[PDB]
């Protein structure tokens, strides 16, 4: 144990699910498999359910198991995992045919979880992985920790994970996710869309979405020099736009910031707190919008930095006209910083770090699965003894 060919990482999210089977060994590659997170559920007279990849003869209903990051249908969710897992087996079993003795003989699974999943959901998933998929080794890695492990392993930090309809805020102290501080706001990328609809009434949804995803949309805090600029439709249609391309991100940025502030203010050990504020981690699709992260930082500074009020400072400098020492405050944060990205994953640098949580998982899985110690995953041994409850003896 274990073959690197064999490591399987799954990262399921509301819209899609990133998947990878086998680690490259030279450098880590950005996940190439992206499967929409949904399954079809046919209902068979007599009550029971059947699950397919396609609307079978238009008889099945379309189930979207994960919504706003939460599992809303645990059965369709497990069926969706099986569907992924089986597909991978078939694919490899064709290509190579000796696969069941090699690449498919011992498949350890790392499943990236979301803060919102029940213990009940996590146990059921564990049961499913050991009983239905007949897999033997499982790590359930929280998304937040994947984040901090990718980010050159930070003991103290805050994860701001911007989704489409919600943003999660998750403080990590001493490599532990602080559950009672964790929260999400019902606000994300779509907010930008919505802000823009108000600013550009005569546009439609696809036009607005296209602007957001275009080279000329940025958050300010040379394109910025031009009054108007140009970009092209999804359907090739050229669209011109004024100052609106520097708008629409503000309401979201303010909401996130207000939340970050209330959160970090409830970290009880001020020495931990100082560290967290100095390692803000921002992740998610939205964050690839040029200027966004820096704009968000800018706002956290504007709202939360402990520093002398400018008027007060200006008086003191007039007074000294007749050198001014720095006023020291008892509060934190006096320093706010974004955590430093690792620049030595070439493939990741190339594609941006909106999905860096996955790199977290590539690193953890290699660590854990290419070393003897079985301290951080459930094994068959353990499953046989405690069952799904085995899960809680290997939490991080």
């Amino acid at each position: 144990p274990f073959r690197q060919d064999s490591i399987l990482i799954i990262y399921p999210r509301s819209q899609t699910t990133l998947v990878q089977f086998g680690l490259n060994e030279e450098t880590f590659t950005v996940p190439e498999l992206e499967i929409p997170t949904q399954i079809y559920r046919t209902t068979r007279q007599d009550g029971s359910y059947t699950y397919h990849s396609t609307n079978k003869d238009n008889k099945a209903e379309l189930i979207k198991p994960i919504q706003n990051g939460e599992i809303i249908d645990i059965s369709a969710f497990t069926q969706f995992l099986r569907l992924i897992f089986v597909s991978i087996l078939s694919d490899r079993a064709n290509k190579n045919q000796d696969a069941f003795e090699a690449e498919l003989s011992n498949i350890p699974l790392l499943l990236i979880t979301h803060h919102s999943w029940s213990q009940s959901d996590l146990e059921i998933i564990t049961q499913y992985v050991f009983e239905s998929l007949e897999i033997n080794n499982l790590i359930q890695l929280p998304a937040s920790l994947a984040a901090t492990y990718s980010m050159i392993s930070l003991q103290n930090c805050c994860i701001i994970d911007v989704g489409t309809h919600h943003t999660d805020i998750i403080p990590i102290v001493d490599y532990a996710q602080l559950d009672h501080l964790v929260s999400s706001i019902p606000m994300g990328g779509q907010s930008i869309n919505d802000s823009l609809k108000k600013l550009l009434p005569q546009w439609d949804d696809d036009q607005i979405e296209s602007l957001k995803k275009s080279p000329i949309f940025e958050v300010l805090s040379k394109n910025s020099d031009l009054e108007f600029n140009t970009f092209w439709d999804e359907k090739g249609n050229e669209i011109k736009v004024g100052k609106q391309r520097f708008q629409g991100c503000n309401n979201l940025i303010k909401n996130i910031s207000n939340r970050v502030g209330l959160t970090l203010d409830n970290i009880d050990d001020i020495n931990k707190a100082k560290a967290v504020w100095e390692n803000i981690i921002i992740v998610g699709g939205t964050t690839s919008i040029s200027g966004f992260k820096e704009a968000l930082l800018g706002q956290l500074l504007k709202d939360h930095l402990i520093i002398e009020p400018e008027e007060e400072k200006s008086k003191r400098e007039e007074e000294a006209k007749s050198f001014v020492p720095t006023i020291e405050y008892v509060q934190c944060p006096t320093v706010i910083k974004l955590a430093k990205y690792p620049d030595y994953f070439p493939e990741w640098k190339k594609s941006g770090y909106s999905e860096i949580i996955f790199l977290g998982a590539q690193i953890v899985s290699k660590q854990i699965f290419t070393h003897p110690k079985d301290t951080f995953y459930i094994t068959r041994e353990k499953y046989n003894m405690k069952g799904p409850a085995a899960l809680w003896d290997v939490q991080f």
Binding site: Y149, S153, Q155, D174, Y175, A176, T375, F376, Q395, F396
Partner: protein
């Protein structure tokens, strides 16, 4: 005889508490050491990464 018997009776539960309390103290100490262990193995995994 009555007094001795009742006193041994009282002590049967005097010893009862001696145990109950001895075993609770044991669990409490073991749980505390388990916290510290988890906390250490965690910090150790982080510092290795």
């Amino acid at each position: 005889l009555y007094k001795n018997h009742e006193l041994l009776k009282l002590e049967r539960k005097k010893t009862e508490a001696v145990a109950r309390l001895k075993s609770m103290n044991k669990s409490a100490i073991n749980q505390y050491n388990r916290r510290q262990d988890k906390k250490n193995k965690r910090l150790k995994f982080g510092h290795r990464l």
